[PDB]
Structures are given as structure tokens and as C-alpha cells.
Amino acid sequence: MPNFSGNWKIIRSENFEELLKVLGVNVMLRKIAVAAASKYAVEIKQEGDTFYIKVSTTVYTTEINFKVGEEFEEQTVDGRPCKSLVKWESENKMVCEQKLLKGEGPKTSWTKELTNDGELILTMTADDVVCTQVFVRE
Numbered sequence: 001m002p003n004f005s006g007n008w009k010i011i012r013s014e015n016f017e018e019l020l021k022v023l024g025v026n027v028m029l030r031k032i033a034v035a036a037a038s039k040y041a042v043e044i045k046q047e048g049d050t051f052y053i054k055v056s057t058t059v060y061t062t063e064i065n066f067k068v069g070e071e072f073e074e075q076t077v078d079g080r081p082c083k084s085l086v087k088w089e090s091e092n093k094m095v096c097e098q099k100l101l102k103g104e105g106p107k108t109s110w111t112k113e114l115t116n117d118g119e120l121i122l123t124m125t126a127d128d129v130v131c132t133q134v135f136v137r138e
């Protein structure tokens with residue numbers, strides 16, 4: 001039965017560069033990252049509240065596994081390791097709060113939501129800045 005499970009392809013990406021700026025990435029790498037972002041693909045497998053997620057671009061791929069409600073280790077958008085915890089906020093929206101393994105830095109979070117119109121919306125937050133990325137089924 002339809003849930004977050006599937007193969008998703010990005011169609012829109014708002015404020016990605018601004019987010020990277022907040023995370024201290026230099027302009028030239030930001031521009032390359034924006035260009036790289038238009039090939040973001042996401043593969044999800046969901047059973048109950050257990051999730052497998054693989055995000056990839058042209059040259060890079062990362063996988064996470066989590067159970068809602070259970071702390072796990074992942075990276076921030078700028079590849080610093082963090083402790084993560086995901087909770088539901090409604091039937092098809094989840095919110096992840098993150099804490100840096102080492103160091104100090106901006107407060108980062110992310111959300112994933114399946115909409116009525118069959119889109120996947122990712123938001124990624126760093127301090128004051130919110131990046132939104134919209135995906136549709138392949």
C-alpha cells in the first residue's frame with residue numbers, strides 16, 4: 001500500500017544555496033553543489049515506522065536506516081556527524097531534530113512529508129534558513 005516507499009526525483013529546490021552559506025560553505029563549492037542538487041534522487045523503503053533511505057547525486061550516494069523514536073547517527077548537510085531523532089507530526093509528516101557529535105554550529109533539522117498530491121517534500125533547516133526540495137515519483 002502507498003507510503004513514503006518509492007523512487008523519487010527532484011523537481012524544485014528553494015533556498016539550498018542560502019542554507020549552505022549558513023553552514024559556512026564557500027561560494028564556488030555552493031554553486032557546484034546547487035548544480036549537483038538538480039540530479040538529487042531519493043529511494044525510500046518504509047515498513048511501519050522503520051525507514052531505509054538512500055539519497056544520491058551523480059557522483060555520491062548515502063544511506064540511512066532509522067526507526068521513528070530511536071536515536072541514530074548520521075551526517076548534517078555539510079557532512080559533520082550528528083545524533084538524530086525522528087518523530088511523527090502527522091500521518092505523513094516526520095521531523096528530525098539533530099545534535100552535533102563534536103563541536104558547535106547552527107541548529108539543524110529536517111522534515112519529510114508525503115502530500116495529498118503524491119509529492120515528497122523535504123525541508124532542511126539551519127538556524128533561521130529553511131530549504132525546501134520537492135520530489136515526484138520516478
Ligand SMILES: *C/C(=C/c1ccc(O)cc1)C(=O)OC
Pocket residue numbers: 040042053055077110112122124
Ligand atoms: C532525505 C534527505 C535528503 C537530503 C537531501 C539533500 C541533501 O543535501 C542531503 C540530504 C535528508 O534527510 O537530508 C537532510
